Amino acid sequence: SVLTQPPSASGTPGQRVTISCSGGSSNIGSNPVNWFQQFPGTAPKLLIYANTQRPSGVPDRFSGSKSGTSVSLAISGLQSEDEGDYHCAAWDDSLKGWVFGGGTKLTVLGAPLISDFYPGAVTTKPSKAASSYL
Amino acid sequence: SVLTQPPSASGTPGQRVTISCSGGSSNIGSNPVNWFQQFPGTAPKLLIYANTQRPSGVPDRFSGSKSGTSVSLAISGLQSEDEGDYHCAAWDDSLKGWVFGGGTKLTVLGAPKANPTVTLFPPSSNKATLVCLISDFYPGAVTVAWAGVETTKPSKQSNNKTAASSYLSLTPSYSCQVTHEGTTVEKTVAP
Amino acid sequence: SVLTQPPSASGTPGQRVTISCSGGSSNIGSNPVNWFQQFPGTAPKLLIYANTQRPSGVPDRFSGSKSGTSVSLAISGLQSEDEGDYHCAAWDDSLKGWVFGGGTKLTV
Amino acid sequence: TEVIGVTSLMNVHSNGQATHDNGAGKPVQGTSFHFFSVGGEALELQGVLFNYRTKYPDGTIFPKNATVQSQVMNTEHKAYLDKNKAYPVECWVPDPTRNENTRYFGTLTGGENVPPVLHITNTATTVLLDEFGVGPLCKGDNLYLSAVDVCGMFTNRSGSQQWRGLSRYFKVQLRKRRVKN
Amino acid sequence: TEVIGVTSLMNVHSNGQATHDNGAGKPVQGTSFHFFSVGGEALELQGVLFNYRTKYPDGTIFPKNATVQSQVMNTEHKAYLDKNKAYPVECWVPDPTRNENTRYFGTLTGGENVPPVLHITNTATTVLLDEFGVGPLCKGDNLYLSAVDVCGMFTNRSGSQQWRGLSRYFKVQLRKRRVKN
Amino acid sequence: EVQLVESGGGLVKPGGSLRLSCAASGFTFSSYTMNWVRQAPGKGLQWVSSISSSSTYMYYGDSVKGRFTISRDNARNSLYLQMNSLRVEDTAVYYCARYAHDWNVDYWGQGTLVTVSSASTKGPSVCLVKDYFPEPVTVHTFPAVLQSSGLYSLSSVVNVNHKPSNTKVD
Amino acid sequence: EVQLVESGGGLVKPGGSLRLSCAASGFTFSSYTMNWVRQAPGKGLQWVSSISSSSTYMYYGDSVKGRFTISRDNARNSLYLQMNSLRVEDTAVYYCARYAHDWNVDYWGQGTLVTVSSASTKGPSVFPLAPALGCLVKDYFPEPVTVSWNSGAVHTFPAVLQSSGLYSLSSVVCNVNHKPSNTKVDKKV
Amino acid sequence: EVQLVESGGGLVKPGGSLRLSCAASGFTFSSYTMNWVRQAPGKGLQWVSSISSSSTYMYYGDSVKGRFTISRDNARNSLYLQMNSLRVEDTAVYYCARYAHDWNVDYWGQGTLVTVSS
């Protein structure tokens, strides 16, 4: 009844990262998984559909695999432009609705008021830049 | 009737390492081999099944080959995260049971040689025990010399450099010479 | 009815090296070539069989090609652990026996 | 006669091999032997071996004293189909030099991709009378039904393959024949 | 009888799976069951299971009290084709030990690449009389038409596959036969 | 090619009501099942409701069963969500998404913010934009800060607009 | 997920007895043959016992033929191992594993530790290691000893198994605790 | 595994004699043709002799025609080479090798040294 995906994942530029999505017979067993990519403060967009397929516009690097009630997303040739949230989605026949995962924030580990910090962090929570008043 | 795999294997990051598993007609000949990956302090986990197949979550890098009564596991694009024991298993029709291999401890190289520091303490108060604490050795295991000797199996420290300890009993001069890649580092104590 | 292979061959680590084995209709024409790898002070071991096939344990790097009466062995992604003698062998129908090549010492 | 449970071969979802990404499972298919006999006595077998050095396993009745000639023809290898779970399919065939009192029919289709083609109907009768209008005569007041229906192989998720078989229905009309001695 | 709408299977443009770069869509093809019966009463079914541990879903009538024997033959699994959207194709077949009062004909062709081959004509009559010149007799002044025509699978753009079926036309000549009850 | 545009989102008080609008261009809207999915600040996605092409099949998440109602007007190329008995938890961006056969959920709109709070619609002071509520404010611009006062503050350095308070001072 | 959880493992003297429990969630437990496999400290894996879905077929490794008994309760979603006549060799982590057709042995539990030792529970004795300094904890049984200093965060060593069957561990840069001997001694260095 | 173990090799004077033994463990020795191959120090390989599973077909290299004799004992899982009239040139490591159909010559033993000198 719930899709389980890692709350976070990371990798070094050029690496292959793997985000898993685990469900049950009522959802992923009998229904296809789409993956959606979300950059902060924009909408989700289709990344993978039908477990393993790319829409036009998605690089060769992005791929999927299905093994029964579990699916994975595979981001190869990791780049900094890939930093964002990855969402897993599939219909559940028992709940008669769409179930999503938690989301997976993918952090990319690369070479480095407030405006352009590369480290990642410095009362605004740093964005992609932070702000302070008092 | 028993599965034979190399007790150890190693490689340089990015290399392909190959671990073999050899059996006979009663096991691997007519039954499939699963491979299980086992990290320190953790359970075995399925890595390869049915000789050559990956469950979801196992990278492309991991692969298998079968030739009759022998199978191999191939770890390509070797990484440090691959450090662990690799267990070979298959049903044996004669023993009506599962047979495993010995296990294969895969070491990944790149970790440079570090200083086996030695901190030999005397007794204190009765009976007389001696303590020779050794730490931070990133090549791994070591030796010891000084009847009453009791030495530990080397333990990874949390900085992934490896620690041990050795103890010597005495009845009421004495040193603790410890070797590490052919090179001795004796500290001493006396009454 | 002799197998002819280069007495020596060499390469830079990471390169593809090619060792050729040339025979006649009486041997390689009508019979398969096995390749055997030999490190100093050990026995020969099967590296390639049936011209082009790897036994389990031989990396994808090692490969063969057959064109009629001649075969080649291809060691790609050359490594130092590949330093040794490479022996070419095949049955000869007229001599009713196994013929080998000279051997090829591969230096890196 | 017909094969019972042909539709069961449409179960393409039971831990099979996806033919391709998001494919259904590869259905049961490949090398098939459909064979059936009606006899007044045991089916009579001739042994023929693909490989004479094949060691047939303890618990099966196989050609004994195999020679290389066993691979093409060796008249030593005679036998009666008189026991179940006994005579492997791959080393025995009806002996055409002696089944006077049996009517046998079989077909081998070989090939990993051979599609199963199974007809069913309650309208199709097969006559068992010979050139002389005599059917099999049941010695000992016994009728002998023999059959093999290896339909193909089931391909598991791993690619590993298991032969899959099906039951065969028989309905035999019999009548009384006056006989001397 | 014939299948109605065979030409619909030439729709190779409706979000299918390109066979190759700039290919048309992969057409409907693969595992097929074409079956049809004419009966004076319900078609009688025997259950046979590909896998006896298969759990047939709520809302279908399936073999009850499945044992491993259910996989080859189990005479417990009898049933009447008396309800639509009810009896899965993959676990029921005409019961050849019954159906005295029905004439049934079907063919299973298995294989992912099996080409559909559907003939149509208004010139082909099939006779329903048995060896004794008696057709099915309609108990309760009722005629029972049963049919399955799983034509193959539609391959969607993703590769995901759906069974695709077609309607079957029947035209049955009937006459009156005197009967003692 | 295909665009969906949401609207109707804003500030409403608990127990309140709100109607959301999706405007579809780029495709035969009247041919496709359509969905509402929402995203609570900092959390992941959560499906709200589905409606078939002909409005024969509506489905709702348990989260809003009995409170929300999905509807479409195929003549007006628009999908609607009627939100009654709104709660604090219902605060989220409300995305509008298409489902196509075999594709599954494919195209999303930009989303529209629904904030459910007792808090009143405080206007900004201007550039700096000081003590305004709620979030959506128009101008290298910096992201806002949520002060403990419950009021936002945002800056920009290289025309300020805050629709919820009709503030359009340059 | 599929989750298997073992329990019941602990310390017994040779000739001792012990019942292990596997709790299965995530799947129709009642559908699968289930296995016990054990791992002796430092050594490789060794299969113990198999049981079919309906308990029609139990099999045992010969190392335990006659002494161990596998069982399941399909109503309680639980696999059991009854270990009688325990020996020193039987010391291992006892894993619980699932067999599935084609997948073969696939899912494993966390394992539960069974330690079989003739050694009885002496409390420790603490010596000051004077100077760069530490504490010594000598001749204690069984294994779990924790060392502390009141937040001085500086390396405690893992213990040594003397031929006595009695452990010793030291700590260098104190508050030692050993629950099995009611020991909570604070020593000065 | 398949293991072949050679033995009987040593130091012998020209004109001398010597019997080599191969011990096969790991396979049904009685089902496969078996070979002797030798390697003179620093030179390549040279096939010596073949024998069929049933000792129906023995073949010899020309270099040892008339002097060497191959034999097997299928009950004792052993292949033998009888070396008569030994010469200086016959100095080599004597390998024992299996031939399997399709696989061809596959498994070799460790070899045994035969030195023929004065």
GROMACS .gro file of C-alpha atoms in nm, chain D:
model
  181
  434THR     CA    1  -0.781  -3.888  -2.789
  435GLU     CA    2  -0.693  -3.525  -2.711
  436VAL     CA    3  -0.453  -3.338  -2.478
  437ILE     CA    4  -0.630  -3.228  -2.153
  438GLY     CA    5  -0.558  -2.876  -2.024
  439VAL     CA    6  -0.418  -2.703  -2.339
  440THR     CA    7  -0.534  -2.354  -2.216
  441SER     CA    8  -0.306  -2.390  -1.907
  442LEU     CA    9  -0.018  -2.304  -2.149
  443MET     CA   10  -0.155  -1.944  -2.170
  444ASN     CA   11  -0.034  -1.885  -1.805
  445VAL     CA   12   0.236  -1.632  -1.907
  446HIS     CA   13   0.250  -1.454  -1.561
  447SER     CA   14   0.381  -1.722  -1.311
  448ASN     CA   15   0.746  -1.611  -1.254
  449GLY     CA   16   0.824  -1.658  -1.628
  450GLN     CA   17   1.080  -1.486  -1.856
  451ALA     CA   18   0.972  -1.141  -1.977
  452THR     CA   19   1.037  -1.171  -2.356
  453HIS     CA   20   1.142  -0.796  -2.337
  454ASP     CA   21   1.107  -0.483  -2.115
  455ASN     CA   22   0.743  -0.495  -1.981
  456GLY     CA   23   0.687  -0.812  -2.186
  457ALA     CA   24   0.459  -1.090  -2.066
  458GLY     CA   25   0.642  -1.413  -1.985
  459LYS     CA   26   0.778  -1.628  -2.268
  460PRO     CA   27   0.502  -1.892  -2.304
  461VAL     CA   28   0.565  -2.271  -2.289
  462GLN     CA   29   0.723  -2.356  -2.631
  463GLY     CA   30   1.004  -2.558  -2.795
  464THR     CA   31   1.098  -2.927  -2.850
  465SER     CA   32   0.779  -3.140  -2.828
  466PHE     CA   33   0.697  -3.515  -2.852
  467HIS     CA   34   0.322  -3.600  -2.882
  468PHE     CA   35   0.277  -3.980  -2.901
  469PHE     CA   36  -0.006  -4.230  -2.819
  470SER     CA   37  -0.060  -4.605  -2.877
  471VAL     CA   38  -0.352  -4.854  -2.836
  472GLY     CA   39  -0.241  -5.220  -2.795
  473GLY     CA   40  -0.363  -5.572  -2.703
  474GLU     CA   41  -0.023  -5.597  -2.520
  475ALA     CA   42   0.262  -5.370  -2.403
  476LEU     CA   43   0.410  -5.125  -2.654
  477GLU     CA   44   0.737  -5.284  -2.777
  478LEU     CA   45   1.042  -5.049  -2.758
  479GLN     CA   46   1.371  -5.021  -2.954
  480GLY     CA   47   1.652  -4.830  -2.780
  481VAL     CA   48   1.829  -4.553  -2.975
  482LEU     CA   49   2.080  -4.320  -2.804
  483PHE     CA   50   2.178  -3.962  -2.899
  484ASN     CA   51   2.510  -4.028  -2.713
  485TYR     CA   52   2.593  -4.395  -2.618
  486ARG     CA   53   2.821  -4.270  -2.332
  487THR     CA   54   2.519  -4.096  -2.165
  488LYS     CA   55   2.478  -4.263  -1.816
  489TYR     CA   56   2.097  -4.299  -1.767
  490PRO     CA   57   2.020  -4.250  -1.398
  491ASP     CA   58   1.952  -4.517  -1.133
  492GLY     CA   59   1.572  -4.583  -1.124
  493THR     CA   60   1.498  -4.566  -1.501
  494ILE     CA   61   1.503  -4.868  -1.739
  495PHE     CA   62   1.754  -4.780  -2.018
  496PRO     CA   63   1.942  -4.956  -2.301
  497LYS     CA   64   2.200  -5.190  -2.138
  498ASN     CA   65   2.541  -5.279  -2.297
  499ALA     CA   66   2.546  -4.954  -2.500
  500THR     CA   67   2.799  -4.955  -2.786
  501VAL     CA   68   2.867  -4.675  -3.039
  502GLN     CA   69   2.627  -4.878  -3.267
  503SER     CA   70   2.355  -4.797  -3.005
  504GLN     CA   71   2.372  -4.433  -3.143
  505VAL     CA   72   2.228  -4.543  -3.487
  506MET     CA   73   2.083  -4.895  -3.434
  507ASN     CA   74   2.164  -5.193  -3.200
  508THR     CA   75   1.905  -5.479  -3.189
  509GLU     CA   76   2.018  -5.576  -2.831
  510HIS     CA   77   1.806  -5.278  -2.700
  511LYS     CA   78   1.455  -5.437  -2.695
  512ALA     CA   79   1.208  -5.380  -2.405
  513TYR     CA   80   0.834  -5.371  -2.309
  514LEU     CA   81   0.661  -5.047  -2.195
  515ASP     CA   82   0.539  -5.232  -1.883
  516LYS     CA   83   0.622  -4.971  -1.609
  517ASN     CA   84   0.554  -4.600  -1.536
  518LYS     CA   85   0.812  -4.335  -1.434
  519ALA     CA   86   1.052  -4.596  -1.584
  520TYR     CA   87   1.137  -4.565  -1.959
  521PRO     CA   88   1.295  -4.226  -2.046
  522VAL     CA   89   1.146  -4.076  -2.371
  523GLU     CA   90   1.488  -3.979  -2.516
  524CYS     CA   91   1.633  -4.337  -2.543
  525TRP     CA   92   1.324  -4.546  -2.642
  526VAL     CA   93   1.094  -4.547  -2.950
  527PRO     CA   94   0.822  -4.785  -3.071
  528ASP     CA   95   1.007  -5.084  -3.232
  529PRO     CA   96   0.870  -5.088  -3.588
  530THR     CA   97   0.998  -5.449  -3.640
  531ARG     CA   98   0.745  -5.565  -3.381
  532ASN     CA   99   0.419  -5.395  -3.276
  533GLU     CA  100   0.185  -5.617  -3.483
  534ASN     CA  101  -0.080  -5.602  -3.200
  535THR     CA  102  -0.047  -5.222  -3.129
  536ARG     CA  103  -0.145  -4.905  -3.327
  537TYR     CA  104   0.107  -4.626  -3.245
  538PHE     CA  105   0.121  -4.263  -3.367
  539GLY     CA  106   0.373  -3.994  -3.266
  540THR     CA  107   0.542  -3.675  -3.387
  541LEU     CA  108   0.869  -3.509  -3.282
  542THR     CA  109   0.899  -3.136  -3.349
  543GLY     CA  110   1.253  -3.019  -3.247
  544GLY     CA  111   1.364  -2.653  -3.196
  545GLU     CA  112   1.379  -2.410  -2.900
  546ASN     CA  113   1.114  -2.178  -3.059
  547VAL     CA  114   0.870  -2.442  -3.195
  548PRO     CA  115   0.519  -2.308  -3.117
  549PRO     CA  116   0.281  -2.553  -2.947
  550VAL     CA  117  -0.019  -2.633  -3.171
  551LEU     CA  118  -0.278  -2.840  -2.983
  552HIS     CA  119  -0.621  -2.918  -3.138
  553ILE     CA  120  -0.911  -3.038  -2.916
  554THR     CA  121  -1.247  -3.179  -3.040
  555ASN     CA  122  -1.501  -3.448  -2.941
  556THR     CA  123  -1.581  -3.503  -3.317
  557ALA     CA  124  -1.261  -3.683  -3.432
  558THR     CA  125  -1.255  -4.068  -3.427
  559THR     CA  126  -0.939  -4.266  -3.537
  560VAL     CA  127  -0.996  -4.626  -3.663
  561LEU     CA  128  -0.759  -4.896  -3.521
  562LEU     CA  129  -0.832  -5.170  -3.786
  563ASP     CA  130  -0.537  -5.289  -4.006
  564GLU     CA  131  -0.522  -5.370  -4.386
  565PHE     CA  132  -0.730  -5.687  -4.300
  566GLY     CA  133  -1.005  -5.512  -4.089
  567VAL     CA  134  -0.866  -5.650  -3.754
  568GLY     CA  135  -0.796  -5.409  -3.461
  569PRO     CA  136  -0.556  -5.484  -3.170
  570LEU     CA  137  -0.659  -5.807  -2.983
  571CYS     CA  138  -0.644  -5.776  -2.601
  572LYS     CA  139  -0.431  -6.071  -2.473
  573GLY     CA  140  -0.519  -6.152  -2.106
  574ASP     CA  141  -0.842  -5.942  -2.136
  575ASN     CA  142  -0.610  -5.633  -2.107
  576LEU     CA  143  -0.598  -5.309  -2.315
  577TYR     CA  144  -0.265  -5.115  -2.316
  578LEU     CA  145  -0.280  -4.733  -2.348
  579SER     CA  146   0.064  -4.569  -2.389
  580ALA     CA  147   0.125  -4.191  -2.438
  581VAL     CA  148   0.385  -3.909  -2.421
  582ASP     CA  149   0.291  -3.538  -2.451
  583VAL     CA  150   0.603  -3.328  -2.379
  584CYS     CA  151   0.442  -2.995  -2.485
  585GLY     CA  152   0.762  -2.785  -2.472
  586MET     CA  153   0.964  -2.616  -2.194
  587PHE     CA  154   0.855  -2.362  -1.929
  588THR     CA  155   1.116  -2.080  -1.917
  589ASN     CA  156   1.162  -1.957  -1.555
  590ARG     CA  157   1.253  -1.589  -1.479
  591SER     CA  158   1.627  -1.688  -1.460
  592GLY     CA  159   1.607  -1.843  -1.810
  593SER     CA  160   1.630  -2.198  -1.654
  594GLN     CA  161   1.400  -2.439  -1.845
  595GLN     CA  162   1.170  -2.727  -1.725
  596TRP     CA  163   0.990  -2.967  -1.965
  597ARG     CA  164   0.607  -2.929  -1.922
  598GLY     CA  165   0.370  -3.223  -1.987
  599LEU     CA  166  -0.009  -3.270  -2.012
  600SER     CA  167  -0.251  -3.561  -1.955
  601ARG     CA  168  -0.400  -3.743  -2.259
  602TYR     CA  169  -0.767  -3.859  -2.278
  603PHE     CA  170  -0.843  -4.198  -2.439
  604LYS     CA  171  -1.182  -4.347  -2.531
  605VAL     CA  172  -1.153  -4.687  -2.703
  606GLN     CA  173  -1.453  -4.871  -2.858
  607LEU     CA  174  -1.396  -5.250  -2.834
  608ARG     CA  175  -1.592  -5.548  -2.984
  609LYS     CA  176  -1.563  -5.932  -2.950
  610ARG     CA  177  -1.367  -6.134  -3.204
  611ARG     CA  178  -1.390  -6.517  -3.237
  612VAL     CA  179  -1.030  -6.662  -3.234
  613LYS     CA  180  -0.873  -7.017  -3.269
  614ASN     CA  181  -0.587  -7.115  -3.024
   0.00000   0.00000   0.00000
